[PDB]
Amino acid sequence: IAMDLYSPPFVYLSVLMASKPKEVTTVKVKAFIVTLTGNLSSSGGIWSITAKVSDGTAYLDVDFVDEILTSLIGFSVPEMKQSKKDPLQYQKFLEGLQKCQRDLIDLCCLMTISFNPSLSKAMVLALQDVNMEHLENLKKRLNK
Amino acid sequence: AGVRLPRSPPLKVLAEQLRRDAAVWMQGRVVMADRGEARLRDPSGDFSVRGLERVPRGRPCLVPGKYVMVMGVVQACSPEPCLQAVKMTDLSDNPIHESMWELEVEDLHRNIP
């Protein structure tokens, strides 16, 4: 029994590759960021960043939903703009920014990932922090 | 872009698994940390890592009692497995990672022929 489609607590990247999906698909891996593949962008009025992540089965280039970043930085793009008018507000941002960098350094958890098979690269939608309920999900899956 | 890493994905492995049996994924409590190196403890046993010399860090200080994941290149399995750190991640935030980790490995190994 290896249809790891929705089998909790998370699934694997190689399972998804091996399945070869016809259209856009949603999974949870428990992954970590290997590197950042690009600069942090604020273009289009929102945050974006390309990292390469992994779950032990494959590597994956991901983009990041503006929602995640705003929370990690505590600042939206427009709040960033106004954090200039006031310099003390900028300071507070500059922190949120290396705070963001710290976060991504130490980031490892379940990632709701949206894989596009055609244009080949995925896009991280949520980050679930791994809890004890997930722990028991893996006990049952390993037939205990 | 400004990056370079091994062709095949980091494998979830335990100290023992290496010690008994090239780019890997291991975790463990920090037993000793000094300069560019540190010795870790997972439920299987102990393993050394070098080259922290050159990995990114969230906190400037790697202290004993922390729990961390290492993506490393294997060095010399005998007589206790050494690693060459490529990247390292701090998991001390979450007490679960420790509990979970032993299983995380089995589950991967069931799922890859």
Partner: peptide, 12 residues
């Protein structure tokens, strides 16, 4: 002017 909170890595 520059952003890119960039953590990033090589080996060898």
């Amino acid at each position: 002017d520059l952003f890119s909170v960039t953590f990033d890595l090589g080996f060898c």
